[PDB]
Design an enzyme around this catalytic site. Structure first.
Site, PDB file in Angstrom:
ATOM      1  N   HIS A   1       1.120  -1.285  -0.101  1.00  0.00           N
ATOM      2  CA  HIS A   1      -0.503  -0.045   0.369  1.00  0.00           C
ATOM      3  C   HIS A   1       1.447   1.580   0.129  1.00  0.00           C
ATOM      4  O   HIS A   1       0.210   2.595  -0.363  1.00  0.00           O
ATOM      5  CB  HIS A   1      -0.230   0.477   0.851  1.00  0.00           C
TER       6      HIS A   1
ATOM      7  N   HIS B   1       5.574   6.635   6.252  1.00  0.00           N
ATOM      8  CA  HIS B   1       5.445   6.081   5.072  1.00  0.00           C
ATOM      9  C   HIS B   1       4.662   7.802   3.702  1.00  0.00           C
ATOM     10  O   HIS B   1       5.056   7.980   4.311  1.00  0.00           O
ATOM     11  CB  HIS B   1       4.017   4.991   4.826  1.00  0.00           C
TER      12      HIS B   1
ATOM     13  N   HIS C   1       1.769   9.564   0.494  1.00  0.00           N
ATOM     14  CA  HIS C   1       0.551   8.576  -0.092  1.00  0.00           C
ATOM     15  C   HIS C   1       1.039   9.780  -1.572  1.00  0.00           C
ATOM     16  O   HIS C   1       1.925  11.150  -1.477  1.00  0.00           O
ATOM     17  CB  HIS C   1      -0.650   9.616   0.405  1.00  0.00           C
TER      18      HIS C   1
ATOM     19  N   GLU D   1      -3.012  13.356   0.735  1.00  0.00           N
ATOM     20  CA  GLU D   1      -5.095  12.697   1.135  1.00  0.00           C
ATOM     21  C   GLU D   1      -5.281  14.405   2.074  1.00  0.00           C
ATOM     22  O   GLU D   1      -6.180  14.213   1.421  1.00  0.00           O
ATOM     23  CB  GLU D   1      -4.786  12.358   2.405  1.00  0.00           C
TER      24      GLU D   1
ATOM     25  N   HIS E   1       3.610  10.499   6.154  1.00  0.00           N
ATOM     26  CA  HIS E   1       3.121  10.181   6.827  1.00  0.00           C
ATOM     27  C   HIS E   1       4.415   9.870   8.017  1.00  0.00           C
ATOM     28  O   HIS E   1       4.403   9.587   8.293  1.00  0.00           O
ATOM     29  CB  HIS E   1       1.954   9.758   7.299  1.00  0.00           C
TER      30      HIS E   1
ATOM     31  N   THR F   1      -5.644   6.775   7.874  1.00  0.00           N
ATOM     32  CA  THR F   1      -6.730   6.772   6.103  1.00  0.00           C
ATOM     33  C   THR F   1      -6.304   4.878   5.705  1.00  0.00           C
ATOM     34  O   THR F   1      -7.273   5.406   3.972  1.00  0.00           O
ATOM     35  CB  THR F   1      -5.764   8.237   5.378  1.00  0.00           C
ATOM     36  N   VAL F   2      -6.262   4.019   6.025  1.00  0.00           N
ATOM     37  CA  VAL F   2      -5.801   3.105   5.579  1.00  0.00           C
ATOM     38  C   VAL F   2      -7.218   2.171   6.546  1.00  0.00           C
ATOM     39  O   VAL F   2      -6.741   2.751   7.313  1.00  0.00           O
ATOM     40  CB  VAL F   2      -5.023   2.046   5.486  1.00  0.00           C
TER      41      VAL F   2
HETATM   42  N1  LIG Z   1      -1.679   7.186   6.058  1.00  0.00           N
HETATM   43  S1  LIG Z   1      -2.249   6.772   8.270  1.00  0.00           S
HETATM   44  O1  LIG Z   1      -1.488   7.123   8.790  1.00  0.00           O
HETATM   45  O2  LIG Z   1      -3.018   7.019   8.951  1.00  0.00           O
HETATM   46  C1  LIG Z   1      -1.500   4.974   8.537  1.00  0.00           C
HETATM   47  C2  LIG Z   1      -1.340   4.793  10.068  1.00  0.00           C
HETATM   48  F1  LIG Z   1      -1.096   5.648  10.884  1.00  0.00           F
HETATM   49  C3  LIG Z   1      -1.108   3.241   9.605  1.00  0.00           C
HETATM   50  F2  LIG Z   1      -0.398   3.501  11.451  1.00  0.00           F
HETATM   51  C4  LIG Z   1      -0.402   2.660   9.254  1.00  0.00           C
HETATM   52  S2  LIG Z   1      -0.017   1.127   9.542  1.00  0.00           S
HETATM   53  O3  LIG Z   1       0.619   0.669   8.225  1.00  0.00           O
HETATM   54  O4  LIG Z   1       1.212   1.858  10.240  1.00  0.00           O
HETATM   55  C5  LIG Z   1      -0.921  -0.195  10.504  1.00  0.00           C
HETATM   56  C6  LIG Z   1      -1.785   0.982  11.731  1.00  0.00           C
HETATM   57  O5  LIG Z   1      -2.204  -0.345  12.192  1.00  0.00           O
HETATM   58  C7  LIG Z   1      -0.726   2.940   7.705  1.00  0.00           C
HETATM   59  N2  LIG Z   1       0.012   2.162   6.624  1.00  0.00           N
HETATM   60  C8  LIG Z   1      -1.238   2.115   5.236  1.00  0.00           C
HETATM   61  C9  LIG Z   1      -0.244   2.741   3.946  1.00  0.00           C
HETATM   62  C10 LIG Z   1       1.418   2.719   3.730  1.00  0.00           C
HETATM   63  C11 LIG Z   1       1.723   0.963   3.689  1.00  0.00           C
HETATM   64  C12 LIG Z   1       2.002   0.336   5.241  1.00  0.00           C
HETATM   65  C13 LIG Z   1       0.677   0.356   6.494  1.00  0.00           C
HETATM   66  C14 LIG Z   1      -0.077  -0.434   5.731  1.00  0.00           C
HETATM   67  C15 LIG Z   1      -1.434  -0.098   5.259  1.00  0.00           C
HETATM   68  C16 LIG Z   1      -0.844   4.452   7.473  1.00  0.00           C
HETATM   69  F3  LIG Z   1      -1.560   4.474   5.924  1.00  0.00           F
END
Ligand SMILES: NS(=O)(=O)c1c(F)c(F)c(S(=O)(=O)CCO)c(NC2CCCCCCC2)c1F
Length: 258
Positions: free
Chosen positions: A61, A91, A93, A103, A116, A196-197
């Protein structure tokens, strides 16, 4: 399983995650005319140790840089936060073209991408996983990326992308200078919202910085060759991975600056 394709993308997430139509969902549109400066916000404090970075991986993702978070070497304090929120991961977006991809959207302006920086309340909760299920559990810093001159501070990341092309791949990633990816001003907006996921949990204090950083078009394009599929599987490309803004539904956005 959830993604950003036609038949698994954001419009379908409510099917398996009905909190998707909740009252504290992110990201949002920020209408500055309506935002109030709040003098009770404390200075934002960012202490980041490059040695805290451990690995970069392709989650399918986005790319995720994971940090050693059993230590308070890298922490976010101040601003709207009570206590110390431990850095967990970074990560990014983007969209399928450079003209939109962020976003959060500010007075109808979209940026090319949005980074983020995810932190969690280790003063109260035992683990990042736990803290993700509480209202004051998480704090996420958002930084917009605008198309401009190439950004030398993204090189450590971009250099690793071929190594993590397929979902599930990981690579050693330490001595990462996160602090230098932030813009020179740290003025921000803050509001209560969500991941946001999926699972879309309403546990995030958002801190969205007003000033964008730059990225070139060529650099941003390298992120879109990451795959959302694993090795030995018919390839699909991660060309877009941003959720659209969701309604405020009564929440107010505060500003750090007047
Ligand atoms: N866009 S977000 O900031 O809200 C967020 C988090 F806050 C977050 F904690 C995560 S997480 O991945 O660390 C798991 C939360 O329990 C993701 N992750 C997503 C997008 C980036 C790739 C890896 C995580 C899988 C989905 C994520 F996108």
């Amino acid at each position: 399983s959830w993604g950003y394709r036609e038949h698994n993308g954001p419009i379908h997430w409510k099917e398996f995650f009905p909190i998707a139509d909740g009252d504290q969902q992110s990201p949002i549109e920020i209408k500055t005319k309506e935002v109030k400066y709040d003098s009770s916000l404390r200075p934002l404090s960012i202490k980041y140790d490059p040695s805290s970075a451990k690995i970069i991986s392709n989650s399918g993702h986005s790319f995720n840089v994971d940090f050693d978070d059993t230590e308070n070497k890298s922490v976010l304090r101040g601003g709207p936060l009570t206590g110390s929120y431990r850095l967990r991961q970074v990560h990014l977006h983007w969209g399928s073209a450079d003209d939109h991809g962020s976003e959060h959207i500010v007075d109808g302006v979209s940026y090319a991408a949005e980074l983020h920086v995810v932190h969690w309340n280790s003063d109260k909760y035992p683990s990042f996983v736990e803290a993700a299920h509480e209202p004051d559990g998480l704090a996420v810093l958002g930084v917009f990326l605008q198309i401009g001159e190439p950004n030398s501070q993204l090189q450590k990341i971009t250099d690793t992308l071929d190594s993590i092309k397929e979902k599930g791949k990981q690579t050693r990633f330490t001595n990462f200078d996160l602090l230098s990816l932030l813009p020179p001003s740290w003025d921000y907006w803050t509001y209560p919202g969500s991941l946001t996921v999926p699972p879309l949990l309403e546990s995030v204090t958002w801190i969205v910085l007003k000033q964008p950083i730059n990225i070139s078009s060529q650099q941003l394009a390298k992120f879109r060759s990451l795959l959302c599929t694993a090795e030995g599987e018919a390839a699909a490309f991660l060309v877009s991975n941003h959720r659209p803004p969701q309604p405020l539904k009564g929440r107010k956005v505060r500003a750090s600056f007047h």
